[PDB]
Amino acid sequence: MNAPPAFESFLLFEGEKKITINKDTKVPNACLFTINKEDHTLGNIIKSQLLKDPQVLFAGYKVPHPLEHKIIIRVQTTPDYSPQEAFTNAITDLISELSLLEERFRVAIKDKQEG
Template identity: 45%
Template structure:
C-alpha cells in the first residue's frame, strides 16, 4: 500500500505493483482510494456503508474509464481530527461481518 501526505497523480505503474493506492487530498479530512481489479460490486457496497456513518460528510465511488480496471473511492469526513482511512477500515470490517453472518445463515 502506498500512502502520500501530499496530493499526487496516480500512475498506472503504481497500480500495477499495488492493489490499493491512497491519495490524500488538499483537505486534511479527505482521501481517495484507487483500487485495482475491483468493480461496482465493492464500490457500491463500500460507499453505502461509509454513508451510514454520521461523521462521514461524503462517500462515493467511480470507475473513471471502462477499459481501465480501476475503482476510485472518495471519502470526506466532517472533523479534521478524524482520519478518513479509519472510517474506511471500519466500513470494510462491517461488510466482512455482514458477509460472514449471511454465509453462516446459508450453511446452517
C-alpha cells in the first residue's frame, strides 16, 4: 500500500529542480550541488572526473537516504576557480569521453563483424 510508484526515481515532480547550487559557508570556494532524481549512476562518474582536476581541493558525493531519490555533490576548488566551473568541466569532458568511447566501440564492432 504505501510503496512509492517506481517512476519516482527518475521523473521530476512539478516544482522540483534538477540541480541546485548552494554556496557553502564553512570554507571559501565551496559549493553543494543537489541533484534530484539521480543516484549512484550519475554521481559517481562526476565525482571521479572531478578528482582528475588539479585545481580541485575536494570533491565528493552522497546519497542522503536510499529511499529518497537525491544526491549531493560538494566541490571545493582553488580561489582562482569556481566549483561552478569545476562541475561544468567534469560534465563537459566526461561527455567528451563517453562520445569518444561510443565512437571507438562502433568501429570495433564493424571490424569484428567480418574482419
